[PDB]
């Protein structure tokens, strides 16, 4: 699963707590996985390659894309980041949709290709 395979760093500890709690309360591992997946999907946006399969270029925490104090405004940062991804693809032809990786450091969003030649840093 893109959210669990590429789980961002802080959401790792939050998700471990949720998984452990639901497992303890219910015993069911499926319930714990469903709850932890629900948390990750609510708390992240999964950027996907607009291709047949360029899928899962990155799972960014939703609060890192957030502009201003409004929680719903993460969509504005999402639009900015997707425009950045498209601009990076279009500007450098040799980069294709499968080359880009989106990932988050502690306080930044990094959009890079498979090589290290192109990295742009998006911070709050």
């Amino acid at each position: 699963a893109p959210e669990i395979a590429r789980m961002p760093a802080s959401l790792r500890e939050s998700a471990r707590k949720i998984y452990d709690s639901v497992k303890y309360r219910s015993g069911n591992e499926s319930m714990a996985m469903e709850q932890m997946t629900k948390f990750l999907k609510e708390s992240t946006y999964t950027f996907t390659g607009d291709d047949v399969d360029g899928d899962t270029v990155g799972v960014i925490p939703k609060n890192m894309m957030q502009v201003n104090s409004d929680p719903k405004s993460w969509e504005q940062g999402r639009d900015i980041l997707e425009e950045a991804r498209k601009g990076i693809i279009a500007s450098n032809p040799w980069i294709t949709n499968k080359q880009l990786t989106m990932y988050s450091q502690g306080d930044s969003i990094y959009l890079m290709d498979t090589t290290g030649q192109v990295r742009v840093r998006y911070d709050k």
Binding site: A5, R6, E83, T115, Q117
Partner: protein, 1223 residues
């Protein structure tokens, strides 16, 4: 951009782990790349510091020029250590460390550092704030955003800068305005982070704990979740995981896939990383594809897979599961890429190129496991066949490119290494690499030519040497002896069997925790060398045997038994027919196992650079004399020999000293006893067939004790010796088998037989028929002594012939052999497709059929010449190259000069993360990069151009003084010829390898290659701009590796399990095959330009296709650390490339056999044959011998781990493939 210090900066970054970009840009700001910068303040240095830093921490234990002067390497190292300390002290904050470096600390620094800590950049001084703003790109800091809030960017849309900044309120301009290019990506900081258990080399105590307590040591390599605190927890976790995976395999992926990998449409791409899966419960019996299905096998042959090594049917199952996963995934990749391309061009069909072979492979494996009715077999009706490569008929299928069908209906696809069409076509169009070989004649041809034409002496010698298969003479008592030919075949067979035993033993030995589990201590080649050396030293000194692990004990026992048997045959060559055969062995009465004494050329060169000729000679003599005086048995045997030689009752010490000096003269002043493969490569004149070097290197002293040289360092003759039984055991075997055959057939020695043959030439110098006869006899002697040269091409043709025979008789072994070769073909063709797609230089210039430009042709000439020169001048011993690479680091030098505690190289070695992590890929890339650098330097020198490696810093990274570089130029001018075209040649070849400056040339090339090409963690296009064809090819391979490491599957796998070892295996396989294909392409383009203009297009179209490039990759791609060579494991008798009454005679032979091999069941794991077993062995290779040889030989090409096959597959999927075109 580069300014003559990139090697030093890179070294001082890998040591004292710190960003290379930090150090370089600090150089930028502080000095702008001048070693002594005039400043009004007073600092004068590369990093611009006098201050108190200088004397500070570094120096004060050595004559320090310091405040006035600093060694640039030492200055950069000290600054790098300071920056690493600051970066670590400030958690990972790169910018805080930069502020502390520039603004100092204590007086004005600490308030500014505190202000930085509380945000508060206003309190920070203007100079320091500007300094951090300069470093924003290269420095990683949590405070980078706050500094940015407190432009040479590629335009998202429209015009640059002002268009997107002053305007474009619409999102895209916003995304441009928030860009902040990072350009600070470090693959080992970001992608592949060294863990605690990676990069941790075990102490002996930990090694014993791991060996005793860990069931499967490979489970130490995985680190899932949080790192275990201590090794006891790691061991416990490893054992728990091993038990869980063993418990899971019965319902695991092997069992699930044991029914229908491809009939069920399984997609391996949508799979978890398959970590625990080792393919143990994998018998592919697909229900359906099973028609008639007898439960009883037809013969005692067939039944099971006829391999003779233990663990067979299990490693075969692992290879099969990995191959099925890989092939099904590659079929899925082909379909997906074809769909993506059909998006662009709907009327385009493309070819899967994998799914036909995979469907037939599932059918074959299903019938093999269900015992009956292979459904992959074609309907052979209305097929005329015709077309024989080595007597194997075949029909070309129009439907499938290449892909012929055999007599029984078995179809071998293209790129299957054994199919006759690909073998024939590779023979017809092979780049310069096709040579004389063994095509001159074979034993059957000489038998007819010489054994029967009117000459007493000619026929006498022929009857002694060559056996006539079918003749009109049919002598009833022609000879009651073995003949040289039969001895040669027998020895080849027994050597091949013991080679397969040694292969299995060495694989088990070098899988042990010391080399596989922890941080990578040594390369695979070096682990092989260490194990072989341990075995040999334990053979010579039995006290060392208690220090061998049981696996190395088995290895040593195999090697000891082999060498003891060889000695026993050389001492008594009359065990064969000839009673007047006497002891080709040089010095008997020296009762002990003779491990052949061969001395490294480059070890001798090192001991001549200092202590030129008399020094090395007298050191060898004095170490031998140390043995003589120390051990009474040595004294006894030497005294007995000297008494016999000089005919004197007493031996004076003067006599033994003179004897030792004379024997050391051979080593010191002659390369007769060195590696010296090239002189053996020449065969004309029968000069060197006399004087076996392995036997003459024999002496009565012991090379074990060392002597202190005048400079105080200790030298032992064992230090000169070359172990590794990879070039050593085969070559010793060839020579000694030739000599054994000569004396076992003829009473005469090699010298006497050669003299007789030259006398026969002198006698029959007239007649053309008789000259042809004596030439055939000479060719027989040349084959027999091993001069010959069978070439690499014999492995696959021998496999084709043997697999045809298996198809006639052993059904299950036949099908298993076809399956393994089909898997190898699919692996190599998938590699060719993926790397033709991914690496640019391949698809644009080399894999393309279009002829290259004149400048590109010159670059190809330079690169291939660099490879040749590397093969000429490279140190063969892996220890030598490892120590040469490691010792040049500053740590070893400073510890040797100043240190009071000894330490040792490989403890103070810096070592790139490319070597510590992903060792095998790095070794392949270093070899290719060094060859490319050699070619580049040679081409620049001959053309007169001055390289960017001429300048002082890069030479300082190596040991190349100003002087040695000029000497290198002179050497290249003296021994290299500049062709009329770009072609490069060598004058005298051997004389060039003789020059001491060749060692300096090789060292320069290797260190430049490492520092400039492999050590950096960044690949950029500008990096590929600098180097030539081989250089940019290897740089694009390094870029491919970095891309694959950043692929989603590989990132996820490393995050979940760490396990750098598995990724290393995968990328190593990729790099080996791809470099093989690239070299083939370059040589093919060169050969195309060698042809006339009209034929170049046809030849390039014919020689540059996926099938021939894939066959070239299967041909070469020699694994660096492969125990023994693939030729040794499966190689036919060199002379032997190719009514009922004789049948009844052979029956009467096999009715009566009462040898122990017939009476007893074969040993599980090691035959350990003695002289009686060798003499009683059949001359023809048995079917189980061939089958075990095939599996061992393909163990290098076809991985046994399904996980590495899956990793290779996912690397390819992230990369992409070509799909052929049209039909």
């Amino acid at each position: 951009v580069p300014s003559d210090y990139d090697g030093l900066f890179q070294k001082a970054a890998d040591a004292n782990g710190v960003s290379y970009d930090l150090l370089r840009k600090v150089a930028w700001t502080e000095s702008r790349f001048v070693p002594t910068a005039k400043s009004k303040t007073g600092p004068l240095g590369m990093m611009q510091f006098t201050k108190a830093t200088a004397k500070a921490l570094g120096l004060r234990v050595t004559d320090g020029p310091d405040d006035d002067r600093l060694n640039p390497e030492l200055a950069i190292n000290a600054a790098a250590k300071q920056l690493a300390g600051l970066v670590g002290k400030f958690d990972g904050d790169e910018l805080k460390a930069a502020l502390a470096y520039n603004q100092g600390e204590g007086r004005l620094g600490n308030p500014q550092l505190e202000a930085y800590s509380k945000g508060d950049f206003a309190s920070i001084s203007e100079e320091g704030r500007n300094y951090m703003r300069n470093l924003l790109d290269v420095a990683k800091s949590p405070m980078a955003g706050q500094l940015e809030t407190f432009n040479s960017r590629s335009t998202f849309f429209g015009f640059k800068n002002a268009a997107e900044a002053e305007l474009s309120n619409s999102v895209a301009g916003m995304a441009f305005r928030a860009g902040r290019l990072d350009n600070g990506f470090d693959v080992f900081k970001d992608t592949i982070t060294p863990t605690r258990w990676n990069s941790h080399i075990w102490t002996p105590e930990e090694l014993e704990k791991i060996r005793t307590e860990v069931k499967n040591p490979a489970y130490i390599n995985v680190v899932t979740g949080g790192s275990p605190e201590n090794l006891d927890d790691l061991i416990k976790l490893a054992n728990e995981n091993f038990e869980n995976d063993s418990r899971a395999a019965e319902a695991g992926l092997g069992a699930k896939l044991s029914a229908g990998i491809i009939g069920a449409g399984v997609d391996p791409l949508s799979y978890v990383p398959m970590v625990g899966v080792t393919g143990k419960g994998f018998k592919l019996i697909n229900k359906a594809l099973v028609v008639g299905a007898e439960s009883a096998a037809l013969n005692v042959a067939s039944e099971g897979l006829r391999t003779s090594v233990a663990g067979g049917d299990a490693d075969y199952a692992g290879a099969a599961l990995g191959g099925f996963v890989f092939g099904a995934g590659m079929s899925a990749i082909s379909d997906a890429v074809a769909a993506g391309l059909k998006r662009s061009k709907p009327e385009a069909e493309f070819d899967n190129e994998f799914i036909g072979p995979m469907m037939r492979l599932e059918a074959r494996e299903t019938a093999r496991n269900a015992n009956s009715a292979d459904l992959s077999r074609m309907n052979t009706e209305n097929m005329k066949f015709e077309g024989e490569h080595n007597g194997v008929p075949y029909e070309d299928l129009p439907t499938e490119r290449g892909a012929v069908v055999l007599h029984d209906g078995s179809v071998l696809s293209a790129s299957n290494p054994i199919n006759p069409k690909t073998l024939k076509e590779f023979s017809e169009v092979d780049p310069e690499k096709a040579a004389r070989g063994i095509k001159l004649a074979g034993f059957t041809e000489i038998g007819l030519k010489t054994l029967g034409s009117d000459d007493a002496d000619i026929r006498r010698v022929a009857i002694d040497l060559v056996r006539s298969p079918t003749g009109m003479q049919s002598g009833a008592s022609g000879k009651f002896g073995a003949t040289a030919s039969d001895i040669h075949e027998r020895l080849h067979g027994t050597d091949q069997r013991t080679y397969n035993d040694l292969y299995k033993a060495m694989s088990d030995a070098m899988k042990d925790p010391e080399f596989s589990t922890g941080g990578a201590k040594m390369s695979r080649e070096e682990t092989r060398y260490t194990i072989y050396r341990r075995a040999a030293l334990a053979i010579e000194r039995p006290e060392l045997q208690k220090a061998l692990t049981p696996s190395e004990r088995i290895v040593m026992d195999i090697i000891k038994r082999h060498f003891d048997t060889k000695r026993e045959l050389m001492e008594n060559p009359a065990i064969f027919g000839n009673t007047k055969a006497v002891s080709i062995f040089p010095e008997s009465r020296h009762k002990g196992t003779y491990v052949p004494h061969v001395y490294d050329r480059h070890a001798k060169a090192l001991m001549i650079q200092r202590y030129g000729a008399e020094g090395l000679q007298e050191g060898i003599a004095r170490s031998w004399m140390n043995s003589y005086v120390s051990r009474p048995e040595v004294k006894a045997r030497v005294d007995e020999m000297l008494k016999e030689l000089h005919g004197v009752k007493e031996v004076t010490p003067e006599m033994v000293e003179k004897y030792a000096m004379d024997k050391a003269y051979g080593i010191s002043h002659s390369d007769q006893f060195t590696n010296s493969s090239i002189i053996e490569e020449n065969i004309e004149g029968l000069v060197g067939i006399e004087n076996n070097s392995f036997l003459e290197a024999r002496n009565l002293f012991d090379s074990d004790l060392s002597i202190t040289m005048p400079d105080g360092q200790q030298f032992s003759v064992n230090d000169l010796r070359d172990f590794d039984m990879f070039r050593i055991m085969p070559a010793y075997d060839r020579r000694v088998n030739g000599d054994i055959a000569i004396m076992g057939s003829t009473g005469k020695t090699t010298k006497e037989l050669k003299d007789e043959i030259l006398a026969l030439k002198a006698k029959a110098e007239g007649d053309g028929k008789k000259t042809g006869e004596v030439h055939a006899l000479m060719d027989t002697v040349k084959i027999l002594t091993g001069r010959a040269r069978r070439n690499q091409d014999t492995v696959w043709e021998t496999s084709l012939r043997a697999i045809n025979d298996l198809g006639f008789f052993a059904k299950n072994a036949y099908m298993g052999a076809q399956n393994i070769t089909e898997i190898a073909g699919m692996i190599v063709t998938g590699n060719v497709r993926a790397l033709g797609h991914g690496i640019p230089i391949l698809r644009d210039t080399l894999y393309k059929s279009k002829p290259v430009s004149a400048k590109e042709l010159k670059e190809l000439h330079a690169s291939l010449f660099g490879k040749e020169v590397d093969q000429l001048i490279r140190p063969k011993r892996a220890d030598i190259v490892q120590r040469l690479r490691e010792a040049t680091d500053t740590g070893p030098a400073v510890a040797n000069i100043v240190g009071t505690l000894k330490y040792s190289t490989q403890e103070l070695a810096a070592r790139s993360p490319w070597t510590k992590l992903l060792n095998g890929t790095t070794n392949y890339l270093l070899d290719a990069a060094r060859q490319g650098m050699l070619g580049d330097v040679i081409s620049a020198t001959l053309t007169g151009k001055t390289t960017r490696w001429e300048k002082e810093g890069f030479l300082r990274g190596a040991s190349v003084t100003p002087e040695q570089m000029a000497g290198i130029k002179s050497l290249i001018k003296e021994h290299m010829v500049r062709g009329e075209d770009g072609k490069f040649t060598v004058k005298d070849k051997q004389a060039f390898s003789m020059d001491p400056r060749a060692m300096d040339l090789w060292r320069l090339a290797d260190k430049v290659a490492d520092e400039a090409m492999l050590r950096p963690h960044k690949v950029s296009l500008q990096d590929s701009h600098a180097f030539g064809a081989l250089g940019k090819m290897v740089m694009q391979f390094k870029s491919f590796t970095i891309k694959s490491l950043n692929s989603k599957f590989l990132r996820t796998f490393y995050d979940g399990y760490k396990n750098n070892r598995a990724i290393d295996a995968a990328l190593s396989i990729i790099t080996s095959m791809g470099l093989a294909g690239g070299f083939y392409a370059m040589a093919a383009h060169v050969k195309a330009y060698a042809l006339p203009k009209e034929k170049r297009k046809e030849y390039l179209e014919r020689a540059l296709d996926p099938t021939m490039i894939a066959h070239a990759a299967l041909s070469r791609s020699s694994q660096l650390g492969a125990p023994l060579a693939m030729v040794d494991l499966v190689g036919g008798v060199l002379g032997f490339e190719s009514t009922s009454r004789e049948v009844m005679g052979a029956m009467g032979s096999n009715l009566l056999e009462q040898m122990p091999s017939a009476g007893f069941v074969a040993n599980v794991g090691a035959t350990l044959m003695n002289a009686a077993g060798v003499v009683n062995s059949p001359n023809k290779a048995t079917e189980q011998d061939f089958m075990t040889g095939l599996m061992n030989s393909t163990k290098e090409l076809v991985p046994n781990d399904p996980l590495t096959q899956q990793l290779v597959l996912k690397i390819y999927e992230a990369n992409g493939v070509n799909l052929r075109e049209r039909r």
